[PDB]
Amino acid sequence: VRSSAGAVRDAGGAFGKREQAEEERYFRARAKEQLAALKKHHENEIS
Template structure:
């Protein structure tokens, strides 16, 4: 609860033009969030695929590719540890 005894969504609850504007902003925020998560997932998959291809061809990895490989290894360890509990 915010100061003054009002709830967090006081503007939305009040309705009217400000309530509609707040609702529209909130919906846009969540649409953009989903869109960004999809873009990040696609970029991560592309980088992972390039790293796997370079490893298969025994080519050297650049800094971003090395970081991606290390992150993938850490994710595997975390997933393995989460499953063990």
């Protein structure tokens, strides 16, 4: 019996949900930052 990549999130136990949330929070933050930068670029390039 072996192990394969991407198995922690295939089980869906506690580590799977923990990893999913650790990913989602980080990328929500980065999406917020990128959206702010996109708005700033929009305004600065209107002219």
